[PDB]
Amino acid sequence: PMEEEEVETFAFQAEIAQLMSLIINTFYSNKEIFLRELISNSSDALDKIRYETLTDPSKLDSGKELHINLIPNKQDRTLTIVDTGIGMTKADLINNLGTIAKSGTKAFMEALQAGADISMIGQFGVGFYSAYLVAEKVTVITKHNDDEQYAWESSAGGSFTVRTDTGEPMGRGTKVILHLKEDQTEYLEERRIKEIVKKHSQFIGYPITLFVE
Ligand SMILES: Nc1ncnc2c1ncn2[C@@H]1O[C@H](COP(=O)(O)OP(=O)(O)O)[C@@H](O)[C@H]1O
Numbered sequence: 001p002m003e004e005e006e007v008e009t010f011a012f013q014a015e016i017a018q019l020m021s022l023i024i025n026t027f028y029s030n031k032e033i034f035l036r037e038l039i040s041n042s043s044d045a046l047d048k049i050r051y052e053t054l055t056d057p058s059k060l061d062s063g064k065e066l067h068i069n070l071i072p073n074k075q076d077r078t079l080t081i082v083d084t085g086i087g088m089t090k091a092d093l094i095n096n097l098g099t100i101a102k103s104g105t106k107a108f109m110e111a112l113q114a115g116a117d118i119s120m121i122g123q124f125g126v127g128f129y130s131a132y133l134v135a136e137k138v139t140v141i142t143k144h145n146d147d148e149q150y151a152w153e154s155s156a157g158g159s160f161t162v163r164t165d166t167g168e169p170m171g172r173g174t175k176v177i178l179h180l181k182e183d184q185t186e187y188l189e190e191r192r193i194k195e196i197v198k199k200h201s202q203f204i205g206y207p208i209t210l211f212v213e
């Protein structure tokens with residue numbers, strides 16, 4: 001039968017919305033750091049599953065090997081970052097990815113308008129939004145041991161949606177799908193991806209694998 005999914009729309013916190021507009025509509029050099037930020041978030045999620053384990057082993061589910069996979073798709077013009085980390089519940093998506101204020105957001109915008117490099121974004125507590133330096137749309141599929149699978153999505157414009165994902169089960173973890181802008185297709189190339197992982201993510205404590213078509 002036909003599947004049905006409930007969709008909820010949310011407004012980004014005021015300053016997060018301002019930061020996204022700034023990011024999308026201003027030229028910045030060194031945009032490649034978006035990958036470092038996404039890999040760091042996967043690394044953090046993998047640390048969480050590691051610390052959640054041994055303590056409470058009787059609640060372990062999905063995935064198996066703790067790792068990060070990078071999957072560029074030239075045909076679809078997408079770059080996907082997949083991890084087997086802890087994942088996020090529906091409440092986590094809503095709270096952590098848009099609705100709650102970050103104390104460093106205003107400071108970061110002030111810094112950028114005065115010439116700071118976008119690379120500092122991670123240190124101001126808003127690293128995820130660096131995804132919009134290269135993506136026109138971002139989809140996040142996630143599955144946490146304590147909830148069902150959900151899909152978060154935003155093309156900016158001040159709001160994002162969250163819905164139950166009835167599509168292919170992904171197992172415990174998170175998948176960030178970047179729909180790359182027309183002028184940012186260099187990030188689909190094997191050599192370029194290897195270059196930036198070596199330059200900015202050469203110390204992550206988990207296996208990172210690049211799948212090349
Ligand atoms: N791969 C992921 N797995 C689980 N949670 C994630 C993932 N990526 C982002 N998140 C959530 O989004 C929040 C915001 O990330 P970010 O903007 O990079 O800030 P920070 O890493 O400083 O918390 C993270 O704290 C985490 O709760």
Ligand SMILES: [Mg+2]
Pocket residue numbers: 037040041122127128
């Ligand atoms: Mg981060």
